[PDB]
Amino acid sequence: DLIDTTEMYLRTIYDLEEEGVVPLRARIAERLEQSGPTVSQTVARMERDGLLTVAEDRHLELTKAGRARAISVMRKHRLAERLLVDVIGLEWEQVHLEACRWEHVMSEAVERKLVKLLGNPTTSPYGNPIPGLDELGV
């Protein structure tokens, strides 16, 4: 369904930060349509693996390693969206759900090829900036 649970939790926390929403476990439960117990257990696993920390106010804080992985996934997502709209010609409304699955399987090798093909894009088709282009070397 999600393809990669960890990556979708990371990107969901990133989404909420972009919206200026407080990233709570309750928000992930809504967005990914999962039970509270599931989200708390998965967040605890990601805390143990050093990808985030639950603060005193209870908001989810990405670590250095957590943010680095979240950026990677979001970068792949928005480059996939650019490819799907500009080249493949998939319908504007269907692109996100396609790019949401593609973000988990794309290598950095393909990302660097897409950057050249698409003429060094800085935003997705929906105007959202593409982060972590520094980490690709472009």
Binding site: R11, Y14, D15, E17, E18, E19, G20, V21, R31, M74, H77, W92, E93, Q94, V95, H96, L97, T123, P125, Y126, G127, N128, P129, P131
Partner: protein, 91 residues
Amino acid sequence: GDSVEPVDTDLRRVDEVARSGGGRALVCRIAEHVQLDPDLMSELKKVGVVPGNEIDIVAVAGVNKPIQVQGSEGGTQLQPGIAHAVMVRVK
């Protein structure tokens, strides 16, 4: 983090613009939250709420009240959670 903290400080959320007394603005960003509803995205395309298009944001009062927007090809109602996730530059 241009995505989280806009480099363009003039970028404002549609809900905040509406609550402040509306105005004409250029659509800049549609967040991943808005994209998750394809039917809504189709409706946004139809009436012309897409990056690089000017829209009129109607003034609104009270939280949990839907925001009216007028595009080039008609108008539509945004939920507060949706209007929060669309960013614009006011002209």
